[PDB]
Amino acid sequence: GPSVSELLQRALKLAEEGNKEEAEKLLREARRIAEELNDEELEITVQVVEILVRQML
Amino acid sequence: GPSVSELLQRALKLAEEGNKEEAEKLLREARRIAEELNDEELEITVQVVEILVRQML
Amino acid sequence: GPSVSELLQRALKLAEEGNKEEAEKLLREARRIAEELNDEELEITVQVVEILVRQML
Ligand SMILES: N[C@]12C[C@H]3C[C@H](C[C@H](C3)C1)C2
């Protein structure tokens, strides 16, 4: 699978392109992985990038 | 007690609601822990979330 | 040399002061170290801090 970091990298690139729907899709999938794993570091990583994407868009 | 990541997750959610005061107190604690452990990953994590929290209105 | 995290923390501080020239110099170094390490966590860290820096100026 893609790692959380690859998913979040691609979301940031898509957000830079103004591609909201595809960016947000990748964020939901990264959040799903982080929450399934109950992984605090993945959770904060996703949470930070979620905010950054919103401001970028 | 709560890890740096957990404190930062809570700080972001309070700041998004509007409660700046307890958000900042969680940032202070997260920073205290990160500096005490002398952990550079935790320090940049705190520093980024500090910026994102202080960014919201 | 310095770690990626150490360069990024300082790049954020320089960007806060409006020193885009110094900030971007340390970002360039942080990115080149992260890229010879093939570290996906360092890559997303560099990417996030790049965006925050470029948002403040
Ligand atoms: N490890 C981190 C990567 C990125 C930058 C900072 C905050 C978030 C997002 C987690 C450190």
Q: What is the DSSP string of C3-35?
A: -HHHHHHHHHHHHHTT-HHHHHHHHHHHHHHHH
- C-alpha B57/C-alpha B55 separation (Å) is 7
Residue of C nearest to A10 (CA): C44
Tokens coding C1 = 């040399």
**Cβ neighbours of residue C52 under 8 Å, at least 6 residues apart?**
A52, B48, B51, C12, C15
Closest CA to A52 of A4, A11, A21: A11
Resolution (A): 1.9
Answer yes or no: do A40 and B6 touch at CB < 8 A.
yes
Domain holding C8, by residue range, is: 4-56
**Closest CA of chain C from B30, distance in Å:** 16
Give nearest CA residue, ligand 1 atom 5.
Answer: C45
Closest CA to B11 of A39, A35, B2, A33: B2
Contact criterion met (CB below 8 Å) for C10 and A14:
no
Q: Which of B47, B48, B49 to mutate to test the pocket of ligand 1 (most atoms within 8 A of CB)?
A: B48
Contact criterion met (CB below 8 Å) for B42 and B34:
yes
- C-alpha C57/C-alpha C55 separation (Å) is 6
- C-alpha B22/C-alpha C8 separation (Å) is 27
The count of domains in chain C is: 1
Q: How far is CA C36 from the centre of its chain?
A: 15
Contact criterion met (CB below 8 Å) for A7 and A33:
yes
